[PDB]
Structure formats: structure tokens, C-alpha cells
Amino acid sequence: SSESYETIFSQRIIRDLQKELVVGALFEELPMSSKILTMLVEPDAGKATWVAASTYGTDTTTGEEVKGALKEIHFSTYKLAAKSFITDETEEDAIFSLLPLLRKRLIEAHAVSIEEAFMTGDGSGKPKGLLTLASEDSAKVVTEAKADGSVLVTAKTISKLRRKLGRHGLKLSKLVLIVSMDAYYDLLEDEEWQDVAQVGNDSVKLQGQVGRIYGLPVVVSEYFPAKANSAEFAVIVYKDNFVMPRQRAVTVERERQAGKQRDAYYVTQRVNLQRYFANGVVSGTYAAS
């Protein structure tokens, strides 16, 4: 029964460390059931939470006001499988000497691809990657870094970032920056630490990454191209939208033959990631020029 049902109820426990890789791999889990879970509902957007039941009934104007929100929350993943195989038909002598050994790895690059696409995705097949949202959140903000040539990615930069988001965001609570390595490359190994960067070690407090640019322990991760023109910087409020419609129980399907003298194990995934607004990130930019 090698590569049947004897281990596959535990590689998902490995995925219980893979999704626990903090490139950003939880905003909020949205457990589910069907194909799509839809709510047409209008989120806490335009508030009005409590009223005192007392003074001015919305005090004239505007009505709704700004959305709202309708879009909707027809929320839906894809099969984001990282289906694998080996040839079992080789190791066929009561082995069982591979059993985490051939995994913890599948589950890795599985998740690595997952957050890779979470920079480098869309909605197609994989959901949104944020560089797609970067180029379209109307905050490709230019020209920040001249980048890879006569550069000063400072924090007046990041001040324009934060004062181009805290609008739609809240203010420094929580809100996140997500960057490149090249960001915390040359904006570390320096005394800048511009208003801040360096490092704010801090350890422990909360989720704890690298840097603490205004306390924000940043996401390098980076699935960018360097090449001067991308983002490094991704200023956005973590605790707003950008939620994770992660759906279901993962069923790797250790199918057998399938010829080629091999056996094939269908490292599934059905999760998704999605927002709640018109806007989202502040995007670079940190451009060719």
C-alpha cells in the first residue's frame, strides 16, 4: 500500500506548517463547502456601527455613502493543486523509508509556488497576485526609486506611500508594507533606518518578520523582478480586505498507474485570496527611471 492511504492523512499536517510560512499566508481563513459561497451583503463599509439611537439620524448626506459594498462576496477558489508523482515501482521491497523524507518538500514548494503566485497571480487559475493589483490599484506611484541607478528609496517615499493609502487604509494600525530583498538590501546595510527600518529586531510581540518600518516587520518574500521597474514596496492595510477564501480539506490523490512506470499523487489545493474595495496596495514605484 505504499503511497496509498497511510500517510496522506498527514501531509496536510505538513501543510499545517506550510501555510504557516509567514510571507503573508494568512489574512483570514474563510472555510467553506460548495463551489462558491456567495454573499451579496454589504460589508461594514459606510459606518454606522452603533448609533446612540439618539442624535441626528445620519445628520443629512450622503446616502450609503461610499460603498458599501456590492461586488459581491461570491467567493470561490480554484483547484490550485500541486499534483505530484514519483515512481514507486522502483522502491518495492517493504521500504517505508521515505515517509516524511520524500515530503516536507512537496508541501514546501507547493506553498512556495502558492505565495509566489500570491505575488504573481491574477484570478485566472490562481487568484490575485499583488503585482497585478499593484499595476491596477491606481497607486503605481511614480517616480519613487529611480532604482538600480542613482537611487534614494528613502521614506519620504514611504511617507507618500502611507499618505497615499491611510486614506483607504486606517493609520499605522495595523497596515503593512511588503517589499523586495533589494529593498532591505540597500536600505539596510546603512544608517537609514530612514525614519525607521533598522531593524526593530524586535522579538517577540506579534507576527514578526524583518525590519519594522514604522514598526511594520516587512515582507520581503519577493517574487518580483529586480530590473529597477517593479514594486518593492507594497503599502496596504493588512486588516482591511485582502482576505483568504481558503476552502476545503486537501485531498492529495495518490493515484497509481498512470504508466511511464510511475505513480502519481495529486497534491491538491483549493484556497483563494480576495479583497473588499476598489483600491488596495500602494505600488512602488520604484521604476526603471
Add this chain to the structure above:
Amino acid sequence: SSESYETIFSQRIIRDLQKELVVGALFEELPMSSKILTMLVEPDAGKATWVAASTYGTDTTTGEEVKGALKEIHFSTYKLAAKSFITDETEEDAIFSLLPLLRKRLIEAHAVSIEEAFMTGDGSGKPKGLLTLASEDSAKVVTEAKADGSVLVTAKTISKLRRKLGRHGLKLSKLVLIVSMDAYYDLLEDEEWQDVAQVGNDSVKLQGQVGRIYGLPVVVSEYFPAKANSAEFAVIVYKDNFVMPRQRAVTVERERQAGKQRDAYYVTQRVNLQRYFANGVVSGTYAAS
């Protein structure tokens, strides 16, 4: 059925979850029953009690001696509702248990709004804003620290007020400091340790607040404006002044229809916030101007 009246005390123990929002909420017990509780007392703000029996009631100077008081101790609350939809209609395709998938959110932001209103409010409908309460007694001791950038009082004025109100308040009964994360970047990322400060664990034996200098386990959490002028500290005897005069358990109101492809949610919360005497609270400042 569903949002009709059934998941009920559910949302009350959810309110038990963010009763534990750790900012002002840990206060003094009060299941009211009338509209406004009114007590009467010329309170702890003047007398000077007890007799030396033979020796006397202190003749000419003085006897009244000031005010007083004849205010008196009426306890005036309002209500926190929560008005928002959920479509309890198109979604009927067999989940409903989906209520926990849908809920909390509003009761969350409800409570968020609640304690931010405690920081920021006007007295009316929400109670009085904590910085406003810092403003009206001029707990603003401008400008101890100065305008967001090399800002200079560690616990210095805090020890000044650990003598000033720390006097009709005391020392570590209760004594707290709500701060900013701008302020957390000041006096955490710290080396001192004045009494306690570093790193803000700090011994422990507290109540759960982020950082601790001296023996004041500290609120950061921060619901003011940052920017140069706010009170980035909050030196208040957290056991004397400012009780919550609550009313009841918050009742939720699962009215359904309320027509036209939607429904009707109300979550009537009547806790409050009220003090007694003059001033058992300082704060900041730390000031632009």
C-alpha cells in the same frame, strides 16, 4: 431559525470576548436597573473626616471648605446598537451554520468603534473621550515631549505625575499608561528600565497590557491621531475615576423583515463610562503646539 432569534447568548459571550479589548474596558462593575442611577454624595474630594472628639471642628478657617459636592452622582448612559444587514434570503441553499462564518465581524467592529469612542467621544451618546478627558482637565502638560522626533520625557513627567496625581491616586494602584506605537517606538525599543520598563514583559503579575514601565502595564493599541500633538502617554489611576456604569447584558435584535431582499440587525449595547471627582488622570504631552 436564523437571525430571527436563535443565536443569541452566543453573541453575548462574543461580547465577553471583547469586553476583553484591553484599553479602558477593565473597569468597575455596575448592573444598573433604572434609567439613570443617581447617587448623592459630597464625595472623596474634600473631607478630611474623623474627630479628635475633644479637639474640635476647626472653627473659623475653614468649614465648608470648598466644593463639595452637590453635583451629584447621576449615572447617565446611552446605547451602542449595531445596524447592518445580512441578506438572510438568497443564501438559503443549505448552510446557515454560516452564521459563524458570517458573524462576529460586526460585533467586532462594533466594539472597535466602542473603545475608540471611549478615547475620542464627546460625552454624549458615546461617553467622554479619553484624550478629551485628558484635554478638559488639561492633563496635557504641554510640551514635555516635543512634536514627534527626538521626544524627551521617558518616565520623567510620569514620575512627576506619580507624585502629582500619584498622591490622590497613588503608586501602582492602579496606575496605567495608554501610549502610542510612535510612543512604543520611543520607550520601547528601549534600554531603560527606569523602575521597570525593559523590555515590558516585565515581571509579571499584571492584567495583560502591552509593555510595562515601572509597574504600569501599558496600553499601546492607540486610537488617537499620532502626529506630534497627541498625548502619547496616559497617566491615570485606572481604579479610582472612570467606572463603566453599564446597564444590562447587550441585547441583540434579530428582527427579520424589514423588506426588500434584506433583513434587520440591532445589537443594543448599554455599557457606559463615568467617573466621580476632579482629576485622577494625566496624559502626555508630547506636543506639536
Add this chain to the structure above:
Amino acid sequence: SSESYETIFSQRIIRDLQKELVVGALFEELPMSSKILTMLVEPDAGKATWVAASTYGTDTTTGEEVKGALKEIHFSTYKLAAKSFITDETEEDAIFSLLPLLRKRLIEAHAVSIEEAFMTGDGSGKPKGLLTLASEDSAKVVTEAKADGSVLVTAKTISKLRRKLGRHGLKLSKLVLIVSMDAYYDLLEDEEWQDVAQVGNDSVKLQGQVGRIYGLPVVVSEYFPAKANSAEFAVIVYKDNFVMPRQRAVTVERERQAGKQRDAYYVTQRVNLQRYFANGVVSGTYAAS
């Protein structure tokens, strides 16, 4: 008599403890029992076999997708010889137990050789060693130190090599620094300890390797050849790079003759160092360059 079986238990338990000599090597040991574990796959080097299976998997380059990746992962370990008879003519004096002194130091230098061989080894009969496995990748980098003159060498080295380890694992898991005490003579009695060099216990905290560099902890001692041109360092994530593919160990034959009457304790051992990737480590360098 002695020189025989009743020793071996009380001998291999001594081996069961310097088993834990951790003085360079400690991984997750692949156990074996046959001979070769040979695995017929290409590891993590782009697959990550993600699927939409749905949209369009970019019909151009390349497929697999890059070099290579099957080595193949063969694993027949290495029979490790130590050997030393004793005064095998004189526990006819029934000493039972001078060997509690008289043994174990054989396990001492035995394991001394083991770990040296492990981190400095040719490939053959052992497997490979660290600076040796450093020594074909051009991880000999340039020119962070300069011929042991102006050797005040900090962590900029470690910064850009940390960015080299900004790689495909994480940050600081594991990411280490098997070092030299002359490499410590750079950054012991440094005034910096810039990021961190010292105390690196720092409490004590991690394995037994105190001194850390952002958590890059310390293994010095009699491995690095000096005069600048070996590494000062061993910047390797212990996780992704390497495991131990061991099988057996001590099944020492305490054979007898061996002339002038002494007992051939023909000492056995079988463990392994072997890798997967292209790169697992850059280190130093720290060169005469």
C-alpha cells in the same frame, strides 16, 4: 571475559552520547538497514508542480522547469574505521572497569575525527566535508576580508551572504555559522556585535553554540585553517541543505589476535553527509584574497 560483548553495550551507549557530539553536524538522520537508498526523482528546483490545469500553463519555456534536478539521490553510507587494542593481557586482573576510564577517549578522538571528517572530508570512504563542499562552488567569495591584515571583519560579509540566503528557505531558519575562534577573534572582543555577534547565548537560548549573528550561532574549533584563506564562516541553512543518511554504527569487532596477544577492537561506524541542491552554503570568505 571482557574485551568482548558486555563491553559493547556499555561502549555503544558511550557512542549513544557522542552520538551527540554536535561540534559541527546535527541533522535529521535518515536511518538505513539495506545499503543504498537510491531515489529516482528530481527534487525541489522549480517543481512545485502547481496546477491550475485549467487556464493556460504558459505554453513556451520550459516545462520541468530548470536545471536539473535528479542527481540521483543514492545513499550507501560509509563504514568508518577507528581501531585501538588495549593492554589485552591484563584484565585477567579482572579490572572490569578501568575501561570507564580507558575506553570512551577512544570514542573521543574517534568522534573528533568523525566531525572533522564530516566538515572537512574528501568524498570517498567518508563522504564530503564542508569547506570541501564549499570548495567547488566558488562560495569562496571576495573580498570581505583581506589576508589577515585589516581583519576587523564585521557582518557585511554576513549581510550579503544573508541576502544570498535570502534564497529559497526562509530567514534565519536555520541559517548558521560554524566558525573559527580566530573568526571569533575578529568578532569576539569586537565592539560590535553590530547586529548581534555576542552574547548569543543570549539567555542561553538555542543548541549549544553560543555567540550568534542575528541567531547565526557558533561552531569554532580546529577545523578552519587560518591565515585568512579559509572561510571564517558556514552560512548554510541546515534545513534545506543536507540530512544525515546513516545506517548502523559501532558493531565494532573486538577481535583478538593481533600478535603479541592483544585484542583487535576493529571499530565500526556508518553515517553520512549528502546533499540535494546546487547550492546549500556560501561561507567566508575571508581570504588571503
